[PDB]
Design a protein around this ligand. Structure first.
Ligand SMILES: Nc1ncnc2c1ncn2[C@@H]1O[C@H](CSCC[C@H](N)C(=O)O)[C@@H](O)[C@H]1O
Ligand SMILES: Nc1ncnc2c1ncn2[C@@H]1O[C@H](CSCC[C@H](N)C(=O)O)[C@@H](O)[C@H]1O
Lengths: 174, 285, 285, 187
DNA sequence: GCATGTGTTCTAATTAGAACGCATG
DNA sequence: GCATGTGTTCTAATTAGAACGCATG
C-alpha cells in the first residue's frame, strides 16, 4: 500500500538493476550533467531516489567531477524541509577515488562511507542516507587489500543491488 | 520599527582581511568576523591590523556544517579562492577539479550550509571573487555551482592599476556603474612617494611575480627617481591596491613577501563599491 | 638682534636624518639642513621622510672650506662618524687613524671650518656622537681634537634599549640629568604591536648584527606571540629607537637593510633631550 | 706677508714637531749660537694650553719620520694640523706666521690626498739632485716654495725611490732658505 | 669580575629578477 | 583581435642566523 518511486539516475545506467529487481517511465537518466540547472531537475517531476556513481575502473573525467556534480544535483532534488514522504540518495564509488577524494566525498556528503565487498574480487564504496545501508553490519575488509584489488585490476554489483533491497518497504511493488 | 543590528560575516580565504577593512571604512558595525585562512603571513597581518577582532578558524576543509549553524546565523558570506590553478598566466595550471582550484568547491559547500532555510526571508548576502583570465569551462562550472553569472569589474577605473575580476553574488546593485570618489587615486603619480616621477597613468595587473611591477613586455620601469629608474615600493603597491599605507608592513616581511600578499588580494576601492549598499541593512557608527 | 631666526644646520654623517626629525618635532624652524651622506638607503629615507628639504652634498671628504663658507653661515654642526673601526665589538677594527675611523677627523676639520671668526658673538652649537665601547686611546684622541670631554648618555634612561653613547658638544645643559617625558616608552612592552608580549623590560644594544635583537649570552628571543618565541619586528625597533612607525619603510628595504640603518643611528628621545634648549635660541614655528 | 726692514726683524720662535730642526735652522742662521726653539715628540697629551704657554711661534714645523714609525703615517699629519690651529695668532697679529709639513715619501696616495685636504693645498715636490738622490713633499704657507720651478718628478719614478730607500741634504734644506728675509740672520 | 658590544664573515635559506607559456576577451 | 596574465621555476645576489672576537667600564 506504499506508492512506487521516481528515480533520478546520474552518470551510470541502473535501468537494468532497477528493472531486473523490479523497481512506462518513472526513471530519469542523464549522462553529461554539465548544463543541468535547477529548473531541469525540477521539471523532471519529483524524485524519491537520487542515484549517482563513478564510472567503472578503466572507463574519462577527473574523479572529483562526479562527486561534485552529484552534490550539486542532489541539492536540487531535495523536498521541502517539512518532509512529505521518504527520500533517499546514494553515491557509489568503484575504487576510483584516491585518499584525498575520499576525504572530500565524506566531507561534502557529511557522513562516512560504507565498504561493500565481494569474495577480495570486486569492491564498492557507498555514501547513503538509508538507515538500512548502514544497519547491515557489512562484511569488514581491509583497505590494503582494497588497494591491491585495484592494482591487479589495472592490468585488464550483486549485494550492491541488494543495497536497493531495503528500499522495497518504502516503495512498490513488482 | 525594529532597528538594524550589526552584521555577521563569514570570510573564506580571507587573506589580509580586506573584507573587514572595507566594512570598517564604510562604518558598518560588525559583531563577529569569522575568517578561514592558512597562510601564517596572512593571519599575522589580520591579527595586528585589526587588533585581534577576527576569529581565525583555520583550514576551510575543517569547517563543518554544524559549525556554520553554531557560529551563525551569518549575514554576509564572502570569499576569494586561489587562482594559481585557474589563471591562464600559469602554463602548469591543474584546472578547477585538481590542485587548489578544487578549494572553490569549499566555498560552494559552506555557502549552501550558511544560507537560511525555507520560511526564512531574512537578508543574506554573499560574494565570490576570481580572475577573468581563466578557462571557459571553469568559468562556466563556477557559474553553475553558484547558480549565477559574474559581474565584471576592472580596478582600472577606480585605482591606478588594471585588474579585471569576476564577481559572483547577490549584493544590492552589483551591476550599477562605478563612480569615482574624492579619495580614489586613479593615477600612478598619486601613489608614489615624494620626489618620484610616474612614467605612466596606469600599471598592469600586479601578481606574486615580482617583475609584474614592470610594465609592458619590454619590462619598463614604472617610476623615475633621481637620475635612475625604479620599480614601485611596497608602500606604493599598497596605495595602488587602495590599502592603508604600511598595511602589510608586519612580521619583518620582505618586498616579495608583501607583494605576495598584495598580489593575491582584492582592490579595496572595488570591494568598497560592492559593500557600500550593505550600509542600508546594518547598524553604522 | 631683532628676533629669533630659523636655524641653519650642518649635519655630517646624517644617516636617516635623525637630526632634522628632532628639530621638526621641537617645532624649531629650519632655514637649511645640509647633510653629508654616502649611503644610498640613508639618503633615500631623508629625501622621502623630509620632502627633499635636505640639501645632500655627498662624500664628507668632498666638502671643502669654500663650500662651508658659501653654504653657511651654520648655526648648528652635528655629526656621528662611523664606529665600525672604533667599536671593540669588531675584532678586526682598524682604529681611529685607519679605515673609516679617520672619518672622525673630517668632522673635526669641518667643525673648525664652520666655526665663527674671532670676536664673533653669534650663537654657534655643535654635537658629536660615538660609542662608549671604544679604545681608551681612541677616546682620548677624540677629546683632544675636539678640546672637550664627552657626556655619557645611555638611551635606556629615556627609551626601551641600552645604548651607552659618548656625546661631545657645547649644547646648553648637556650635563643635566635626563628626565623621562610623558611621550617616552621606557619598556619593551610599549613598543610591541598588538598581541605581542615582552620577555624583557629593556633590550640590549641593537647593532647591525641580525642577532643583536636577541638577548643575553643565551641569545634569548625578545618577545612572545601565540605561545611561540619571536624576534622584534622592524616597526617595533623603530618604536624602541624612538622613530615614527614605518619611518624606515622605504625603497623596498629588507629587515637587514632597515636594521642596518637603525643600528647605526641615534636614539630619538636622547637627541630630543639634547636639542630641547635650542628652541629658546631659534625661531619656533 | 710683506717684507719688513732689517732692524725691525726679530729672532724666529720655532715649534718643531716630531723632528728637531735645531741643527738645520742654526746652520742657516735663524737661532744664535747661544740658547727659542721648542721640540716636542710626544704630542699625544699636548693640549692647547701647553702650546700657548710654550710661547708665541712664528714657524710651526712638521715632518714625517724617514726608519720605523711608532705611529701610523696619518697620525703625524692630523696631530700637526691640530697643534697648528692651536698656535695660530690672533687675526690682528703682526709678525710673519709660517707653517710647514714635510713628507719623506712615506705617505700613500690616499694619505697624500688627506694631507692636501686638511692643509687646503697640493704639495710641492723638491728633488735633490746625475740621477735623483733625495726628494721630499712639502706643504707650507711660504710663497717662494710654491712658486719656484722645481724639477718635475714622475710618480712612477717616486715609488722607485720609496722602494730602494725602504730597502735600507743641502738643496733639501732650502725650504728654510726663503725665511731669511723675514727673520734675524746670525753669522 | 665578567657580561657586553653604532662588526665582520661564514652557512642554508630566500629574495629579486627573468624566462616561460598560450588561451581568452 | 592579439596581447595580457591573483603563476611557477631557476639563477645569482642578499638575507637571516650564528660563530668569532677581546678590550673595557
Ligand atoms: N585550504 C585553505 N583554507 C583556507 N584558506 C586557504 C586555503 N588555501 C589557500 N587559502 C588562502 O586563500 C587565499 C586566496 S587569495 C584571496 C585573498 C583575499 N581576497 C584578500 O583580500 O587578501 C590566500 O590568502 C590563501 O592563503
Ligand atoms: N665618507 C662619508 N661621507 C658622509 N657620510 C659617510 C661617509 N662614510 C660613511 N658615512 C655615513 O656615516 C654614517 C655613520 S652612523 C651615522 C648615523 C646618524 N648619526 C643617524 O642618526 O642616523 C652612516 O650612515 C654612513 O653612511
Amino acid at each position: 500500500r506504499r506508492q512506487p518511486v521516481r528515480v533520478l539516475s546520474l552518470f551510470e545506467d541502473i535501468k537494468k538493476e532497477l528493472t531486473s529487481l523490479g523497481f512506462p517511465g518513472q526513471l530519469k537518466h542523464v549522462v553529461d550533467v554539465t548544463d543541468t540547472v535547477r529548473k531541469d531537475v525540477e521539471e523532471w517531476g519529483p524524485f524519491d531516489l537520487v542515484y549517482g556513481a563513478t564510472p567503472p575502473l578503466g572507463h574519462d573525467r577527473p574523479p572529483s567531477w562526479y562527486l561534485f556534480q552529484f552534490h550539486r544535483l542532489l541539492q536540487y532534488a531535495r523536498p521541502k524541509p517539512g518532509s512529505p514522504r521518504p527520500f533517499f540518495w546514494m553515491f557509489v564509488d568503484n575504487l576510483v577515488l584516491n585518499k584525498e577524494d575520499l576525504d572530500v566525498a565524506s566531507r561534502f556528503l557529511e557522513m562516512e562511507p560504507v565498504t561493500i565487498p565481494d569474495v577480495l574480487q570486486n569492491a564498492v564504496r557507498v555514501w547513503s542516507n538509508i538507515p538500512a545501508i548502514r544497519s547491515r553490519h557489512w562484511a569488514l575488509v581491509s583497505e590494503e587489500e582494497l588497494s591491491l584489488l585495484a592494482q591487479n585490476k589495472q592490468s585488464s554489483t550483486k549485494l550492491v543491488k541488494n543495497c536497493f533491497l531495503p528500499l522495497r518497504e518504502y516503495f512498490k511493488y513488482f | 520599527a525594529e532597528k538594524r543590528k550589526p552584521i555577521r560575516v563569514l570570510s573564506l580565504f580571507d587573506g589580509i582581511a580586506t573584507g573587514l577593512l572595507v566594512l570598517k571604512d564604510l562604518g558598518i558595525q560588525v559583531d563577529r568576523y569569522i575568517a578561514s585562512e592558512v597562510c601564517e603571513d596572512s593571519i599575522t597581518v589580520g591579527m595586528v591590523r585589526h587588533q585581534g577582532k577576527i576569529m581565525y578558524v583555520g583550514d576551510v576543509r575543517s569547517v563543518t556544517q554544524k559549525h556554520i549553524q553554531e557560529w551563525g546565523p551569518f549575514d554576509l558570506v564572502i570569499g576569494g579562492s586561489p587562482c594559481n590553478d585557474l589563471s591562464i598566466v600559469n602554463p602548469a595550471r591543474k584546472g578547477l577539479y585538481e590542485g587548489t582550484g578544487r578549494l572553490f568547491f569549499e566555498f560552494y559547500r559552506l555557502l549552501h550550509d550558511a544560507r537560511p532555510k525555507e520560511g526564512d526571508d531574512r537578508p543574506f548576502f554573499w560574494l565570490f571573487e576570481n580572475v577573468v583570465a581563466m578557462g571557459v569551462s571553469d568559468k562556466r562550472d563556477i557559474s553553475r555551482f553558484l547558480e549565477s553569472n559574474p559581474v565584471m569589474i576592472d580596478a582600472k577605473e577606480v585605482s591606478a592599476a588594471h585588474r579585471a575580476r569576476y564577481f559572483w553574488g547577490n549584493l544590492p546593485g552589483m551591476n550599477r556603474p562605478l563612480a569615482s570618489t574624492v579619495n580614489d587615486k586613479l593615477e600612478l603619480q598619486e601613489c608614489l612617494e615624494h620626489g618620484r616621477i610616474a612614467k605612466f597613468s596606469k600599471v598592469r595587473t600586479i601578481t606574486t611575480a615580482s617583475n609584474s611591477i614592470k610594465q609592458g613586455k619590454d619590462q619598463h620601469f614604472p617610476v623615475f627617481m633621481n637620475e635612475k629608474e625604479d620599480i614601485l615600493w611596497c608602500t606604493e603597491m599598497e596605495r595602488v591596491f587602495g590599502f592603508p599605507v604600511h598595511y602589510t608592513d608586519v612580521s619583518n616581511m620582505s618586498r616579495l613577501a608583501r607583494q605576495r600578499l598584495l598580489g593575491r588580494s582584492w582592490s579595496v576601492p572595488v570591494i568598497r563599491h560592492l559593500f557600500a549598499p550593505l550600509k542600508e541593512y546594518f547598524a553604522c557608527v
